[PDB]
Symmetry: D2
C-alpha cells in the first residue's frame, strides 16, 4: 500500500500544520482486539485506546453485527418535533435506567463530546429561563479542564493552547484552580488541605459574582487531556455541597470517565456524587460510530417541560441526534461493558499498572511523578525535580520517548510534557506488563 508517499489533503487535529512536520504520519491500517498495525505491517499495543474510546477493543463481532442489522432496517431517520424511531427509544430508556442513581430523566442525543458539552451549556441557560431566573448566565470551570472545541466548550476550557488562535468567545466564563497535588498555587501536597483551599476559593468567587448570575459549574471527575489530574476524594463531594448552597447546576463531563475508565460506571458516582447533568461520548459506542449524549435530571427536566410560554420550546438539536445506527451500536457496546465488568477490570489492572510504573520515578530524573485512576494515567516529565517545571514540548523530548515506546511495540500519547496511557478497558495483566516494559525501554533510550 502506497500511503507512505501520499499527499495530505486533511488537517490533523491538535498538531502543527507547518512543513515539514505536517508531512510526517504514522498511518494505522488495521485494528483487532487491543492491537493496531500500521501500513508498514508493524504491530503495537494500542496504549491510547484510539482516543480513550475504543474501550471494548477493535473488531468486536457483536457490535459489527448490530450495525449491519440496523443498516438493513433503517440506517437513519430524524427525531425532530413529533417524529422518532425505535432505536432512540431503546437507548434513552437504557441510559436513564443506568443512571437512576443520579435521577437522570431526559437525554438529548448528539454525535460527540463537544456536542454534549455545547448542549449542556445552552440547555443549562434554558433551565434557568424556564425557572424564571434569566439572570443565571455565567459558567464556572477548572484550570486544565477540557470540554471540547465548539465555541461554548472552548470558552470554558482551562488550557490556553486551545484558545490562542480563535479570539474572544463566550463572555462571563470563570476559571477555578484545580485540586492538583503536583502543581498548585499553595505548593500543597496534602489532599484534605488542598481540597479546602480550592473550595474556599470557589465560595469567594461565587460571592464576588453573585450566585444569582451563575448558571452552572462544569468539571471532569478526572481531568483527562489536562494531564490525568485525579482530584482528592473529598473534592467532588464538597463541590456538590457548594453548588447546592446556591442552586448552581453541577455538570459532570463524563466524556472520558463515562462507562468505566476510572473504576466506576461514572466518575461522579465513583466519588459518591450525583451531578445535575451528564456529558457522554467516546466509549459510549466504543468509537465504532460517532455518538454523544447529554442527560438531564428530573429537577431540570421538570422545569423545562413545565416552562411557561416559549421557555418549554427546545430549539436545540442535530440532524444526527438519535442516529439509529449509532444507537444500535451503543446498545451492543453497553452490553459488553456490563457483562465483562469493564469498570471492574479498569480498577484492578490500572492499579497494578500504576504500581509497576512507580520505580520509573526514581530511575529517571525526567520522570516527575506517575498518577492515575483506573485506566487513565499520566507520566509528568519535568526539567527540575524540585520546582516541578514541565519539560518544554518544543524541545521534542516527550515525543521522542513516545516514538521509542512505539518501536518497542506500544503506542502512547504525548500531550505537552506528559505521556498519556489510556488503553482499552479489556487490558489484561499481560498487556499491562508489556506497556511497562516498552516505557522502561523508551526512557533508557530517550530519558
Amino acid at each position: 500500500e502506497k500511503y507512505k508517499n501520499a499527499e495530505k489533503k486533511f488537517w490533523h487535529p491538535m498538531g502543527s500544520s507547518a512543513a515539514p512536520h505536517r508531512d510526517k504520519t504514522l498511518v494505522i491500517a488495521r485494528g483487532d482486539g487491543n492491537y493496531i498495525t500500521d501500513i508498514d505491517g508493524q504491530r503495537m499495543l494500542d496504549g491510547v485506546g484510539g482516543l480513550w474510546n475504543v474501550n471494548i477493543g477493535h473488531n468486536r463481532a457483536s457490535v459489527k453485527a448490530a450495525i449491519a442489522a440496523q443498516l438493513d432496517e433503517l440506517a437513519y431517520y430524524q427525531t425532530f418535533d413529533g417524529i422518532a424511531h425505535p432505536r432512540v427509544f431503546d437507548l434513552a430508556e437504557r441510559l436513564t435506567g443506568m443512571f437512576a442513581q443520579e435521577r437522570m430523566a431526559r437525554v438529548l442525543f448528539s454525535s460527540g463530546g463537544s456536542d454534549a458539552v455545547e448542549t449542556a451549556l445552552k440547555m443549562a441557560r434554558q433551565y434557568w429561563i424556564a425557572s424564571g431566573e434569566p439572570g443565571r448566565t455565567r459558567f464556572l470551570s477548572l484550570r486544565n479542564g477540557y470540554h471540547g472545541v465548539h465555541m461554548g466548550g472552548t470558552s470554558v476550557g482551562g488550557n490556553g493552547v486551545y484558545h490562542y488562535n480563535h479570539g474572544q468567545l463566550l463572555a462571563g466564563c470563570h476559571l477555578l484552580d484545580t485540586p492538583w497535588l503536583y502543581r498548585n498555587p499553595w505548593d500543597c501536597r496534602d489532599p484534605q488541605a488542598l481540597t479546602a483551599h480550592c473550595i474556599r476559593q470557589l465560595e469567594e468567587q461565587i460571592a464576588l459574582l453573585g450566585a444569582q448570575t451563575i448558571a452552572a459549574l462544569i468539571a471532569e471527575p478526572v481531568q483527562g487531556a489536562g494531564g490525568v489530574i485525579v482530584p482528592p476524594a473529598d473534592y467532588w463531594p464538597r463541590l456538590r455541597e457548594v453548588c447546592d448552597r446556591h442552586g448552581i447546576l453541577l455538570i459532570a463531563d463524563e466524556v472520558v470517565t463515562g462507562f468505566g475508565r476510572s473504576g466506576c460506571m461514572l466518575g461522579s458516582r465513583g466519588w459518591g456524587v450525583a451531578p445535575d447533568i451528564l456529558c457522554l461520548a467516546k466509549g459510549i459506542t466504543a468509537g465504532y460510530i460517532p455518538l454523544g449524549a447529554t442527560l438531564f435530571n428530573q429537577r431540570i427536566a421538570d422545569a423545562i417541560e413545565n416552562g411557561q410560554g416559549f421557555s418549554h420550546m427546545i430549539m436545540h438539536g442535530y440532524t444526527y441526534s438519535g442516529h439509529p445506527t449509532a444507537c444500535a451500536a451503543a446498545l451492543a457496546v453497553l452490553d459488553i461493558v456490563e457483562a465483562e465488568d469493564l469498570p471492574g477490570n479498569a480498577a484492578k489492572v490500572g492499579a497494578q499498572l500504576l504500581e509497576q510504573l512507580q520505580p520509573l520515578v526514581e530511575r529517571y530524573a525526567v520522570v516527575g511523578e506517575v498518577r492515575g485512576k483506573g485506566l487513565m494515567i499520566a507520566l509528568d516529565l519535568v526539567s527540575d525535580k524540585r520546582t516541578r517545571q514541565p519539560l518544554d514540548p518544543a524541545a521534542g523530548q516527550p515525543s521522542r520517548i513516545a516514538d521509542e515506546a512505539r518501536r518497542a511495540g506500544v503506542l502512547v500519547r504525548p500531550i505537552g510534557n506528559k505521556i498519556i496511557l489510556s488503553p482499552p478497558l479489556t487490558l489484561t495483566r499481560d498487556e499491562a506488563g508489556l506497556m511497562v516494559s516498552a516505557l522502561e525501554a523508551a526512557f533508557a533510550r530517550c530519558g
Copy 2:
C-alpha cells in the same frame, strides 16, 4: 411492537417539550428507496428525505457494503497530530478533487453540519491571526439564515426562535436582510432591484463596522430552514465581489445545497461563485453515518500552514474527525451521486414538481406562494394575500395540513408557516406526482 404506549425518555429537537404535545410520536420503523413505514405499518413517501440528507435513498446496498468492509478492517482510529489511517486520505483527496474548480486545498473533518459551521467560524479566526490581522473577528450573516446550533452557529442564525432560550451568545455578529422576494423591507418583487437593495445594505454595514474588523460572511446558497429562500441570480455573484473588495472571507454553508439538491454539485457553483470556505454535511454520507467537513481554499490553507509561531498549530478538531467508517460510507455515496447524475435529476424533476404545484396558489387562499430550486421547495402559507402575513403555527393549521398529506401517503415538514418539500434526489417523475396529489388532498381537507 409496543412502542405506541412506550415511555419517552428523550427530547425532540425543535419541538415543545410540554405535555400533552410531548407524548405524541410518529415512529418510523423501516426505510427502502424513497419510502418509509411507521410502527403501524403505514407506508408513505419520504417527502422530507430524512432531514434533507438521505439524498440517494434508504437501504442502498453499496453503501452498507462499504460500511461493513471498513468495520472488518478498522472501524475507528484517531487522526490527531501525526496519526491517521487510509480512509481519511482517500476522502480528503476526493473532496479537494471534486472542488478543484473552487481551488479547495484542505479539509477539517467532523460529524455534522453544526460542526462544519463552528469549524469554519473558528478557523476563519485562526486564518486572520496567522495572516497577522487579529482585529478581523466579527461575523456577518443573513436574516432567516440557519447554521446549526452550536454556540457559534447559533450566534449567526437569522431566526429568533433559536435565540430566545439561551441568553447572550457570541458578540460581534451582525445580521443583514435576506434577498427574499415574498417578504422584504422594500416590498420589492423585482429580483435585480432587490439584489441592489441588499448589496447596498451590505456595503453600508461594512462601512459602519470597518472592513478591518470583519472576518467572514456566512450564507446558504439557498436558505433552507429559513423557508427555501432562493436568492436572485445576481445576488451571490455580487456577494463575492463585495467580499473581495474588502478581503472578507466568504463561507458557503452547503450543508443542504451541497452535492446536488438545488441543481448543482455546489449551490455556490450553481450561482457561478467560488467561496473561500465550504461547510458540508448531511448528503455527504446521505445520513448513513454522521460526517461533516469544512473545506478551505489554497489562500486560507497556505496562510495557516505558513503562520508564524503558534498560529500554525491547529488546536481544533474532534475525536471522530476523519472517522474511517464514515469516510468509507462517504466514498460509496459520492460514487452514486456522480454516477447517477443526481444534481441533474434534482434540477429536472424539481422543476417539474415546482411547476405542478403552482395551481395550488390560485386554488387555495391559504397558499401564498410556492417557490423552490431543484428538490428543495416550500409552500408559504398566509392568512392574507395582500399583506402576505404568515399563518401563525400556534393555531396549528400548517401542522394539520402536514398531517393530512401523511394520511394521503407523503410525509412533509411544517416549519413555522411553511410546508417544506425536500425528498431524496433520486426522486422520479412518478414520485413527484404522488407528492402533488397528497398536497392537493391536504389543502382540500385542511386548507
Copy 3:
C-alpha cells in the same frame, strides 16, 4: 504667545498627527454671544461653545451665584446619608420643571456622557429590581450620538467613534434613522418614512425578543449626527411601541434640553414623555460641568421598593450634586425661563433657516440645510443626484469654516456638515450676520 507653544494636550475629535495638530484657534475671552481670540479678533459664537453656552458668555448673575456658593461650601459629597443645600434645591427644581414627564428622582453627574452611562446602568438596575434580569439589550438609532464612555460609545450610531477602540458592550442594536434626505428606502415622504422605521423597530423587537430588551435611547433631534429632524409622528409611535413591550425610552436631551429646538424638552416638543431624561450642556450653560439623569415615578418606585440588594444604588460620582455647579444651574434656569429662550430659539431659528435656503440654490456643494429652533446643519455633498457626502479628508468643509470665521462667525464642521448652534439669546440681526458670513464663505470656498 500661545501661537508657537508646544501642545501637551489632545484635542477631542481631531487628528493627532503632525503637522495638523500644531495649529490652534486659541479663544481668549467671551462676553455675550461673542468671543475674542489671542489675536484680538472677535467673532460671533455660532457654535455656542459646543451647543451649551445657551445664555451667552459672561452673565453677571450666574458668576454672582458661583461666587456666593464658593464662600459657603464649594463642595461636599452626597453619598449615602449626606448632602448639602444646593442639591436639594436643584433636584426639587428639575423635578418641578418636568412634572409633565412624571420625573421623580435625579442622579447627578458632570456631563452628557455621564448622564447617558447613568441612564444605561440604572435601566439595568431598574429591571433587576423588577425581577427581570433578562432585560439587558439596548436599541439606538443610526447617526445617534450619546457620548464616549464605553456604554454610550456602544450605542453610538456613527462608525468614526468605534474604529479605534475595539469590542465594547455586547447586545447593542442599531436602527435606521427617520432621515428624509438619506434612508434605506429612498423614501421622500415623512409619513411613509416613519411607517418604514416603526415597522423595522417592531421587526427587530420580534427578532431579539422584547423580554431581552432593556431600553431604547434616542435624541429628539439628532445633533452631532447632522441635525436630522424626525417626522412629527415618529416620537409618538416610538413611545407607543416601547409601551407595547414595557421597554424603557431614554430621551437623550443633552443638546435639546432647555430650549434649543423650541421647547424645554424636545420630547415634550413632540408631545412625548420618556421614561428617562439625559441632561447636560445647557443645564449650567457651560459655566460649570454638570449632568443629570432623571427617572420617572415608574422607575423610582421599582428600585426603591426592590427586594434585598436591588434597592442599593451603587452608582454615582464624587462630584454628583456638586454645590457650586448646582448654584450655577439654579441661576441659569432662572434666565432661561425669564427670557423665554425656547421661544426665541423657535422664532429666530425659523427665521435663520429661511434666510439660509438660497445657499442651496446658489452653491452646488450645498445639498440641503435643515433645522428646528437653533440647531441647524448644512449638508455638503459631492453630487446632487446621489447625495453622496463630501469627504472631510479633502478638507473643503474645514476651509469653508475658516473663511466664515474670517468673516466674523465661528461655525463647526462635522464630517461633511456645517453645524450652526449659537446661544439661544441670538437676535434677529445676529442671525443676519451669520447668513452673510456663510454666503461669503461659500463664495470663497464653495
Copy 4:
C-alpha cells in the same frame, strides 16, 4: 428648613429604600478642615469631602482664581483645532510635574471615572495604532476600585458595584491583591505574598496569551477597597512583569495622586513609572470637577504616528479642558507644592496611625488598622481569629460613625471598614481629635 424637605435626588452608594432613604446629614458650610451642618454643629472633616478636599475648604486664592477666570472665559471647547489659555497652562504643568514618569500628553475630563474610562479606551487605541488590534483584554486587582462608568465598573474588584447592572465589558480578568490581613494563601510574610501574587500574574498571562492583553490597571494604594497598602516590592515587580510582555501599566492615582500617601504619586513612592496616570479628586481639591489621564512618550509617539484613521482621537468630552476647572487646578497645585502637602501627610499620617493602635488593643471589634500617609482604615470584624468582616447591613459601622460625628468628627463607613481621609493640611492637634472621637465612638457603639 431642609430637614423636613422632600428628597428628589438619590444618594450614591446607599439604600434608596424608605425609611433609610430620608435620613440625612445636611452639610451647610465648610472652612479649613471643618464643616458645619444645618444645625450649626461643626465637626472635623475626617473624610475630606470624598478624599479630595485636600487643601481644605474655602481657600481664598483658589476662589480668586475661579472668579478671575469666570470674568475672562468661563468656558470654551477644545475639540479639533480649538483651544484656550488655561488648558495649555495645565497640560504643560502636569507633564512637567511628571517628567520623571515621562508623561507626554494629557486627555482632560471631569472626574475619576472619566479618567479611568479614558485610560482604557486609549489603551485600546494605542495597540490599534501599533498594528496589534488583538490586544483587547484588561487586568486588575481584587478589591480594586476604579469608578462607575461601564468600563471602570467592568474592572472593579468589589462585587457590590456589579450586582445590579448585569453583564458589562468582556475580557477583564481579576488578580488577587497583596493583602497581608486577608489572602488566599493566609500568607503573613510580605516578601512571600508578593511572590505568590506575581507568580499568579505570570500564570494568568500565560493562560490568556500576552498578545491578547492590552493593559493592567491598579491603585498604588487601594482606597475604597479598604486602604490596602501593598508590599514595597510588589509594584516594582508589577512594572517588570508588564514589561516582559509590553502590557501597559495603568496607575489609578485618583486618590493617591498629589500626596495623600506621602508622595506626589503613589507609584513614584514605590519607585515605578507607569505608562498611564489617572488623576482626579485632589487635582482641583474638589472646587471644580476635573479629571485627567496622562500618557507617556511611548503611547504618544505611537498614536500620533499611527497610519490612516488610527491617529484620529475620537474620544473626549464637552468639558475636556474646562478653563475655570483648569484655573482652579493651577491654584491648588501651587498650594500642594508650596505647603509640601505630601510630606505633611507622610508625617501626620504616621503619627495618626501610631496613635490609633491603642484602639486595636482595646476593642474586640477592631481587627486591624492600616494606612500609609493620610488614608487609613480601621477593619471591623465579628471574630478576631477568622478575620470575618462585620456585615454592613447590620448597621454597626454606621452607628460607630454616627457617634464619632456626635463627638465632632465626620468619618466614612465603607462596608466593614471605617475610612479616615482628612485634608492633607491636617495638624497634630486635629489628628489627636480624630483619635479622641473614635475612642468615644467605640466606647459607645463598639
